[model samples]
Target: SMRQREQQLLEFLDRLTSLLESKGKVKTKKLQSMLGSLRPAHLGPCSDGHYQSASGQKVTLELKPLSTLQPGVNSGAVILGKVVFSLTTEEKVPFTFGLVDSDGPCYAVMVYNIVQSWGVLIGDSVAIPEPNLRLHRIQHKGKDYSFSSVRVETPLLLVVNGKPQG
Candidate 1:
């Protein structure tokens, strides 16, 4: 049931928000609103398991559940996720975010060199193709964060809300 799924998402967001807020403050309103417009991921590629990129390259990738993503270069794989929270980084070049999909769990994504004009906001659905996943365990201000993250090298192959990222 979609309603149940939505409810579950809300719960996950609530738990994450409070945990993050305890460690540091977060913009709850912004986070909630992002999930407000979240849509179910379009499984697989655009056209019969094939996707034509903006750079004129034909790609074939399968959208996988965020929780199922493992550490390493998940080559030829795609994932659909909605922003649950945005992280303020030291460099600020690669916009960092915590994302959640229909399945469950919070996944992190770091997008480098994203165009300012096409900046992604909270609640925007993102599809990352060829996700390079990494397992990380960090301790910040006496709190530990352990998670699997995706590193998107470029936006040329990204899809946001069914449109090209750039």
Candidate 2:
């Protein structure tokens, strides 16, 4: 029983590390260098409930912009925004948050992580540094922009620059 439990723990740790590396929180080289020092204690719990697996394990995430547009896609620009709200569910978690640009107003972006635990939550700003932007025709939404293969970041301030006012 001890061996089985240890193996499970090790596997969980490996998954956590992989997720962190994928999300850019931990660098590959750094992880390798610190592998010996790496331990289960190093992995911390996330307040954002959605960013975890069904088993309650935290998912790894990378901080980046939302869209990486292809050529002829509105000048190929990236969008950044603040975290207004984040919702998570076993079926379709509303990982919806808002972002405001210097241009003018703010827009809402919604995402669905098939795995509820792998979702993001409210007040967590995510940037899609290079999103695959394209024009998509939605039924009710009407002429809208779409992006694929986007990366998500947490804690807001890390990706964008600005000290907490309060």
Candidate 3:
């Protein structure tokens, strides 16, 4: 579930930066391409979950920094960040609303289903609004589940010509 959220986020980033995909596979290019345009300016907050404001944060579910490589990573995948959803064995729910990648000379986190609304003078300014993030599947209650999200800033490193890019 967590991985799925991360994957969705990755795809989102990919599409956001697809323009740069043509730049080839340079580490910097890969980093930006992987990161995509996810700033508050690029991503919108929810008028409400599934699409909360880019700046909004949720305090309901707790998160602990995790350390582990995502299983079956992508090209140059690495464990960017890890956190356990410390709900509880009985109360813990299973579902991926967001994810964080904290590796590869960079890091980032994604939050989902946050309640964000703006009271504008003229609501008409925005005809149709979109949600920020959405829950992937049902939150299954039972044994606390653990999941990790990962990314490859540059498809791993290779000793080409016997040296790293930098």
Candidate 4:
């Protein structure tokens, strides 16, 4: 899979550029090239393809925030939150990490390309800076929801900032 990352990175930049252009912010920093030079993620040195998926933190995440955009009002669209481990970090990229209220399950965790960007290799026992965007959830599970919580932390997920999913 040589150059697959390049293709994806370019595609990501392309999408990002298009999105920014639509928003009237026509310049995006060069990231695809910076990312291309880095080594591809060393896929899961966590487990030797063993019982890793079944194990995770016994934490609760609040899913009552914004997921979409507001009309006319420009969201600051900044990054928020941090990384705090409950048990251990065996999570995988491109997987839906769970989001639960104090009662139970709600939204799913979203760690977009974090492993590919930089895997949580040392685990989450010691807190680390997890990049997340600051925007409210407008829609979750096909329904519109309004919340005021900023970057609520869960067992496996952090309500992050920067990347707005609308």
Clashes of each: 2, 18, 18, 16
Evaluate residue 107 in candidate 2 and report its C-alpha lDDT on the 0 to 100 scale.
Answer: 40
Per-residue CA lDDT of model 2 for 1-166, tens digit only, reads: 3465545444433433333224324344543443333222211222233343333555443332333234332222334444433333333333434443222233444454333234333333344332333333322212232322222322231232222211
Candidate 4: residue 148 Cα off by (Å) = 15
If both were scored by lDDT, which would come out higher, candidate 1 or candidate 4?
1
In terms of TM-score, which candidate is stronger, 2 or 3? 2
Q: What is candidate 1's lDDT per residue for 1-166, written digit by digit as tens?
A: 3455445444444444454333223355654555566554433244245566445688777767777777887656677777656653344556667677643456767778765544566566887876789887755434455656688777666777877654
Per-model TM-score on C-alpha atoms: 0.63, 0.31, 0.18, 0.20
Error of 3 at 70 (Å): 16
The parts of candidate 4 lying over 4 Å away from their true place are 1-29, 54-136, 139-166
Candidate 3: tens digits of C-alpha lDDT, residues 46-154? 1113332224643121112223222332212111121211111121112121222223321122322223321211001111111121212322322222223222122
lDDT values of the candidates? 0.62, 0.34, 0.24, 0.26
- CA RMSD of each candidate after superposition: 11.0, 19.7, 18.7, 18.9
Candidate 3 local accuracy as lDDT? 0.24
Steric clash count of candidate 1 = 2
Error of 3 at 59 (Å): 9.8
Ordered list by TM-score, greatest first? 1, 2, 4, 3
Q: Model 4, residue 89: displacement in angstroms?
A: 24
